[PDB]
Structures are given as structure tokens and as C-alpha cells.
Amino acid sequence: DADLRRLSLKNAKQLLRKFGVPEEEIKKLSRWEVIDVVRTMSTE
DNA sequence: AAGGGCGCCTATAAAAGGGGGTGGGGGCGCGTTCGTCCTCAGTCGCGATCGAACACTCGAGCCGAGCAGAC
């Protein structure tokens, strides 16, 4: 979660693209929501 | 047409300061990069509130025993 917050939005966007997260969540690009979704996907 | 007589230049050294040059060096200014500080956002921890479960107390019902009445 510390390194996930240290992802600095842009690389988290590329990671969400890599996992196969749908483009709506990538599109809103809220940082906190993005990092919560990528933490959830790394839990999944 | 011919017959005569003299300063210009050139050269040498030396000083003075200007005229007459573009080239090099130094200084200043501007721009870019890096570092530091501040602000914002996110995450984690703690506290408070709400809900659920368990325990205790009270009330009600049922059963048993005793007493009284009748045969």
C-alpha cells in the first residue's frame, strides 16, 4: 500500500492496463480509487 | 634647339603621442537545472457507538401436601 501509493498515478494506470482492469476505472483516473482498485486486483 | 645649374627622393638611428585595427579577454546577464520546502492526499490506527448475546431476576403456572368437611 505504501509502494502502491508511491506508484505516482501514471505507472498505476499502466499497471491497471496490464492486469486487465476495464477502461472506465482507468479512465476516471482518481488516484486514491486507482490505488485501492490495484490493491484489490493484487489481492485477487 | 641647346645650355645650363641644385632640391625631391631613397637610407640610418632615436624620442614623443596620434592615427588607424581587428582580435582577445574579461565581466555581466540570462537561462537552465537541481535542491529544498511546503502542501495535499492517502493510509493506518484509535476511539466511539451500536448491536447482539448471555445471564440473571421476576413472574406465572403446575404439582403436591395438608386440612377440613362430609358420609
PDB file of C-alpha atoms (C1' of nucleotides) in Angstrom:
ATOM      1  CA  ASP A   1       0.000   0.000   0.000  1.00  0.00           C
ATOM      2  CA  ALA A   2       2.998   2.310   0.654  1.00  0.00           C
ATOM      3  CA  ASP A   3       4.639   1.403  -2.707  1.00  0.00           C
ATOM      4  CA  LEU A   4       1.160   1.358  -4.302  1.00  0.00           C
ATOM      5  CA  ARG A   5       0.689   4.992  -3.195  1.00  0.00           C
ATOM      6  CA  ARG A   6       4.328   5.609  -4.358  1.00  0.00           C
ATOM      7  CA  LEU A   7       3.305   4.362  -7.849  1.00  0.00           C
ATOM      8  CA  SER A   8       2.689   8.046  -8.868  1.00  0.00           C
ATOM      9  CA  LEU A   9      -0.668   7.770 -10.764  1.00  0.00           C
ATOM     10  CA  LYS A  10       0.840   7.175 -14.273  1.00  0.00           C
ATOM     11  CA  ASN A  11       2.558   3.858 -13.530  1.00  0.00           C
ATOM     12  CA  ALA A  12      -0.547   2.705 -11.628  1.00  0.00           C
ATOM     13  CA  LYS A  13      -2.558   3.475 -14.789  1.00  0.00           C
ATOM     14  CA  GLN A  14      -0.170   1.288 -16.793  1.00  0.00           C
ATOM     15  CA  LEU A  15      -0.440  -1.459 -14.143  1.00  0.00           C
ATOM     16  CA  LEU A  16      -4.261  -1.381 -14.289  1.00  0.00           C
ATOM     17  CA  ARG A  17      -3.927  -1.683 -18.069  1.00  0.00           C
ATOM     18  CA  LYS A  18      -1.606  -4.676 -17.557  1.00  0.00           C
ATOM     19  CA  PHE A  19      -3.933  -6.553 -15.164  1.00  0.00           C
ATOM     20  CA  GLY A  20      -6.929  -6.227 -17.496  1.00  0.00           C
ATOM     21  CA  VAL A  21      -8.947  -3.725 -15.435  1.00  0.00           C
ATOM     22  CA  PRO A  22     -11.740  -2.218 -17.615  1.00  0.00           C
ATOM     23  CA  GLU A  23     -11.078   1.164 -19.233  1.00  0.00           C
ATOM     24  CA  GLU A  24     -13.724   3.013 -17.180  1.00  0.00           C
ATOM     25  CA  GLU A  25     -11.735   2.669 -13.939  1.00  0.00           C
ATOM     26  CA  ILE A  26      -8.529   3.541 -15.815  1.00  0.00           C
ATOM     27  CA  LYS A  27     -10.400   6.479 -17.378  1.00  0.00           C
ATOM     28  CA  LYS A  28     -11.710   8.189 -14.238  1.00  0.00           C
ATOM     29  CA  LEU A  29      -8.099   8.161 -13.047  1.00  0.00           C
ATOM     30  CA  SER A  30      -8.857   9.210  -9.480  1.00  0.00           C
ATOM     31  CA  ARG A  31      -5.577   8.402  -7.734  1.00  0.00           C
ATOM     32  CA  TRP A  32      -6.923   7.059  -4.409  1.00  0.00           C
ATOM     33  CA  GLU A  33      -9.593   4.991  -6.199  1.00  0.00           C
ATOM     34  CA  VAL A  34      -6.931   3.747  -8.658  1.00  0.00           C
ATOM     35  CA  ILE A  35      -4.626   2.607  -5.858  1.00  0.00           C
ATOM     36  CA  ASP A  36      -7.495   0.922  -3.983  1.00  0.00           C
ATOM     37  CA  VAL A  37      -8.500  -0.920  -7.169  1.00  0.00           C
ATOM     38  CA  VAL A  38      -4.913  -2.013  -7.893  1.00  0.00           C
ATOM     39  CA  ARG A  39      -4.525  -3.203  -4.270  1.00  0.00           C
ATOM     40  CA  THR A  40      -7.779  -5.166  -4.700  1.00  0.00           C
ATOM     41  CA  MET A  41      -6.577  -6.637  -8.020  1.00  0.00           C
ATOM     42  CA  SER A  42      -3.215  -7.599  -6.485  1.00  0.00           C
ATOM     43  CA  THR A  43      -5.250  -9.288  -3.737  1.00  0.00           C
ATOM     44  CA  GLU A  44      -7.344 -11.111  -6.368  1.00  0.00           C
TER      45      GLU A  44
ATOM     46  C1'  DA B   1      67.247  73.898 -80.095  1.00  0.00           C
ATOM     47  C1'  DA B   2      70.516  73.946 -76.954  1.00  0.00           C
ATOM     48  C1'  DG B   3      72.815  75.075 -72.424  1.00  0.00           C
ATOM     49  C1'  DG B   4      72.995  75.235 -68.313  1.00  0.00           C
ATOM     50  C1'  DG B   5      72.805  74.709 -62.833  1.00  0.00           C
ATOM     51  C1'  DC B   6      70.503  72.164 -57.447  1.00  0.00           C
ATOM     52  C1'  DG B   7      66.438  70.254 -54.000  1.00  0.00           C
ATOM     53  C1'  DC B   8      62.726  65.547 -54.206  1.00  0.00           C
ATOM     54  C1'  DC B   9      63.622  61.232 -53.181  1.00  0.00           C
ATOM     55  C1'  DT B  10      65.938  56.885 -51.068  1.00  0.00           C
ATOM     56  C1'  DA B  11      68.751  55.221 -46.274  1.00  0.00           C
ATOM     57  C1'  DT B  12      70.305  55.093 -40.639  1.00  0.00           C
ATOM     58  C1'  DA B  13      69.339  55.839 -35.559  1.00  0.00           C
ATOM     59  C1'  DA B  14      66.445  57.834 -31.822  1.00  0.00           C
ATOM     60  C1'  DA B  15      62.238  60.029 -28.628  1.00  0.00           C
ATOM     61  C1'  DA B  16      57.446  61.913 -28.393  1.00  0.00           C
ATOM     62  C1'  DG B  17      51.629  60.722 -28.990  1.00  0.00           C
ATOM     63  C1'  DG B  18      48.052  60.054 -32.546  1.00  0.00           C
ATOM     64  C1'  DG B  19      46.175  57.816 -36.365  1.00  0.00           C
ATOM     65  C1'  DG B  20      44.453  53.721 -37.786  1.00  0.00           C
ATOM     66  C1'  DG B  21      42.763  47.927 -36.392  1.00  0.00           C
ATOM     67  C1'  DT B  22      40.642  43.986 -35.656  1.00  0.00           C
ATOM     68  C1'  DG B  23      41.254  40.253 -32.003  1.00  0.00           C
ATOM     69  C1'  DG B  24      41.224  38.539 -27.451  1.00  0.00           C
ATOM     70  C1'  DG B  25      39.927  38.574 -22.762  1.00  0.00           C
ATOM     71  C1'  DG B  26      37.012  39.671 -19.029  1.00  0.00           C
ATOM     72  C1'  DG B  27      32.734  40.743 -16.974  1.00  0.00           C
ATOM     73  C1'  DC B  28      27.879  40.707 -16.686  1.00  0.00           C
ATOM     74  C1'  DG B  29      23.449  38.907 -17.572  1.00  0.00           C
ATOM     75  C1'  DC B  30      20.282  35.359 -18.593  1.00  0.00           C
ATOM     76  C1'  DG B  31      18.737  30.747 -18.659  1.00  0.00           C
ATOM     77  C1'  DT B  32      18.552  26.163 -17.046  1.00  0.00           C
ATOM     78  C1'  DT B  33      18.946  22.686 -13.667  1.00  0.00           C
ATOM     79  C1'  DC B  34      18.914  20.974  -9.115  1.00  0.00           C
ATOM     80  C1'  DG B  35      17.617  21.009  -4.428  1.00  0.00           C
ATOM     81  C1'  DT B  36      14.700  22.107  -0.696  1.00  0.00           C
ATOM     82  C1'  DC B  37      10.423  23.179   1.357  1.00  0.00           C
ATOM     83  C1'  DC B  38       5.568  23.141   1.646  1.00  0.00           C
ATOM     84  C1'  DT B  39       1.137  21.341   0.760  1.00  0.00           C
ATOM     85  C1'  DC B  40      -2.029  17.793  -0.259  1.00  0.00           C
ATOM     86  C1'  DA B  41      -3.574  13.181  -0.326  1.00  0.00           C
ATOM     87  C1'  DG B  42      -3.757   8.597   1.289  1.00  0.00           C
ATOM     88  C1'  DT B  43      -3.364   5.121   4.668  1.00  0.00           C
ATOM     89  C1'  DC B  44      -3.396   3.409   9.220  1.00  0.00           C
ATOM     90  C1'  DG B  45      -4.694   3.444  13.907  1.00  0.00           C
ATOM     91  C1'  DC B  46      -7.612   4.542  17.641  1.00  0.00           C
ATOM     92  C1'  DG B  47     -11.890   5.614  19.691  1.00  0.00           C
ATOM     93  C1'  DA B  48     -16.744   5.577  19.978  1.00  0.00           C
ATOM     94  C1'  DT B  49     -21.175   3.776  19.093  1.00  0.00           C
ATOM     95  C1'  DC B  50     -24.339   0.226  18.073  1.00  0.00           C
ATOM     96  C1'  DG B  51     -25.882  -4.385  18.009  1.00  0.00           C
ATOM     97  C1'  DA B  52     -26.067  -8.970  19.622  1.00  0.00           C
ATOM     98  C1'  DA B  53     -25.674 -12.446  23.002  1.00  0.00           C
ATOM     99  C1'  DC B  54     -25.706 -14.157  27.555  1.00  0.00           C
ATOM    100  C1'  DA B  55     -27.005 -14.120  32.241  1.00  0.00           C
ATOM    101  C1'  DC B  56     -29.923 -13.022  35.974  1.00  0.00           C
ATOM    102  C1'  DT B  57     -34.201 -11.951  38.025  1.00  0.00           C
ATOM    103  C1'  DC B  58     -39.055 -11.989  38.312  1.00  0.00           C
ATOM    104  C1'  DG B  59     -43.485 -13.791  37.427  1.00  0.00           C
ATOM    105  C1'  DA B  60     -46.652 -17.340  36.405  1.00  0.00           C
ATOM    106  C1'  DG B  61     -48.194 -21.952  36.340  1.00  0.00           C
ATOM    107  C1'  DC B  62     -48.377 -26.536  37.956  1.00  0.00           C
ATOM    108  C1'  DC B  63     -47.984 -30.012  41.337  1.00  0.00           C
ATOM    109  C1'  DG B  64     -48.016 -31.723  45.888  1.00  0.00           C
ATOM    110  C1'  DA B  65     -49.314 -31.686  50.577  1.00  0.00           C
ATOM    111  C1'  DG B  66     -52.233 -30.587  54.308  1.00  0.00           C
ATOM    112  C1'  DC B  67     -56.512 -29.515  56.358  1.00  0.00           C
ATOM    113  C1'  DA B  68     -61.368 -29.553  56.647  1.00  0.00           C
ATOM    114  C1'  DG B  69     -65.797 -31.357  55.759  1.00  0.00           C
ATOM    115  C1'  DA B  70     -68.961 -34.907  54.739  1.00  0.00           C
ATOM    116  C1'  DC B  71     -70.503 -39.519  54.674  1.00  0.00           C
TER     117       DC B  71
END
